[PDB]
Structure 1
Amino acid sequence: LIVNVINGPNLGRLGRREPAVYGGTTHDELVALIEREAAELGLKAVVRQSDSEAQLLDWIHQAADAAEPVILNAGGLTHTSVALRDACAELSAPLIEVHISNVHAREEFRRHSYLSPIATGVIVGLGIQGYLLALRYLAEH
Structure 2
Amino acid sequence: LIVNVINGPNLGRLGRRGGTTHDELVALIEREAAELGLKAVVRQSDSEAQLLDWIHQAADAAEPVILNAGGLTHTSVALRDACAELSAPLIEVHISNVHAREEFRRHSYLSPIATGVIVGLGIQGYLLALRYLAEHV
Give TM class, smaller chain: over 0.9
Q: Following TM superposition, by how much is the alpha carbon of 1:15 offset from its aligned partner in structure 2, in angstroms?
A: 1.2
Q: Following TM superposition, by how much is the alpha carbon of 1:112 offset from its aligned partner in structure 2, in angstroms?
A: 0.2
TM-score normalised by the chain length of structure 2: 0.98
Q: Which runs of 5+ in 2 are unaligned?
A: none
Find the residue that maps to 2:12 and give its secondary structure. Answer: helix
Find the residue that maps to 1:3 and give its secondary structure. Answer: strand
Q: Following TM superposition, by how much is the alpha carbon of 1:95 offset from its aligned partner in structure 2, in angstroms?
A: 0.3
Instruction: Give deviations 1:73-122, integer Å, cap 9, x for gaps.
Output: 00000011100000000110000000000000000110000000000000
TM-score normalised by the chain length of structure 1: 0.95
Instruction: Give deviations 1:34-71, integer Å, cap 9, x for gaps.
Output: 01111110000000000000000000000011110000
Give the paired residue count. Answer: 136
Find the residue that maps to 1:114 and give its secondary structure. Answer: coil
> d(CA) in 1 for partners of 2:20 and 2:60?
31
> d(CA) in 2 for partners of 1:39 and 1:64?
23
Cross-structure match for 1:15? 15
> d(CA) in 2 for partners of 1:46 and 1:105?
30
Greater fraction of residues in helix: 1
Cross-structure match for 1:20? none
> d(CA) in 2 for partners of 1:84 and 1:36?
28
Percent identity over the alignment? 100
Write out the 4+ residue segments of structure 1 that deviate beyond 4 Å after TM superposition.
none
> d(CA) in 2 for partners of 1:134 and 1:63?
16
> d(CA) in 1 for partners of 2:135 and 2:85?
22
